[PDB]
Amino acid sequence: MVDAFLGTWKLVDSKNFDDYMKSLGVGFATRQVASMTKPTTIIEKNGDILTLKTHSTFKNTEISFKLGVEFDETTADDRKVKSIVTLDGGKLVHLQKWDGQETTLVRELIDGKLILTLTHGTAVCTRTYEKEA
Ligand SMILES: CCCCCCCCCCCCCC(=O)O
């Protein structure tokens, strides 16, 4: 089920991330730095617990979760959210809820690349990651 997502991934393309960040209320200076950062995302499993690390020169995060079980999360931009990650149509779908707002972080594999689609409000960002050996 989740196995093809596992490993270490590097950002190689980003579209509309500033629009996504601005929709979330991220301040201009953080957006500026974020627009020039290329994170590494590491996805690992131990039994049915997944751990997703996002590492960069700017912010680092780490979450652990069971698919289909809600968890508390504090995002890179400091939102305290209620989250769930599931597998839907072969895509790893991460839904965050806070203050009646929602955002989705959808990951799918296309030609071996990991495409992350971020949606909040009307903003839709697509970020492409490529697998590291
Ligand atoms: C990684 C620097 C971004 C920091 C500030 C904006 C955070 C927005 C929410 C998380 C976005 C994750 C994007 C990704 O994993 O490529």
Side-chain angles (χ1 to χ4, degrees), residues 29-78:
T30 295
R31 304 199 309 275
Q32 194 186 106
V33 178
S35 72
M36 294 295 286
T37 301
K38 299 184 184 181
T40 297
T41 301
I42 306 166
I43 312 180
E44 290 167 291
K45 84 181 183 176
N46 183 169
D48 61 343
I49 303 302
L50 290 161
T51 298
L52 192 155
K53 310 174 172 183
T54 309
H55 291 170
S56 78
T57 53
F58 182 30
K59 307 280 193 201
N60 296 300
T61 58
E62 178 174 316
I63 62 176
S64 294
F65 54 89
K66 182 177 284 183
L67 293 169
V69 179
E70 187 175 69
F71 58 105
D72 286 300
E73 175 181 10
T74 301
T75 67
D77 60 313
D78 306 309

Side-chain angles (χ1 to χ4, degrees), residues 11 17 20-21 24 26 30 34 37 39 41 54 56 58-59 75-77 79 105 107 116 118 127 129:
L11 185 75
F17 191 45
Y20 178 76
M21 291 187 287
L24 291 173
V26 178
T30 295
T37 301
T41 301
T54 309
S56 78
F58 182 30
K59 307 280 193 201
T75 67
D77 60 313
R79 293 173 282 117
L105 305 87
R107 291 179 170 87
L116 170 63
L118 307 174
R127 285 162 68 88
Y129 283 81

Side-chain angles (χ1 to χ4, degrees), residues 4-18:
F5 293 96
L6 303 179
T8 299
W9 299 94
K10 318 294 252 195
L11 185 75
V12 297
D13 189 70
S14 185
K15 298 180 171 81
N16 297 347
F17 191 45
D18 182 73

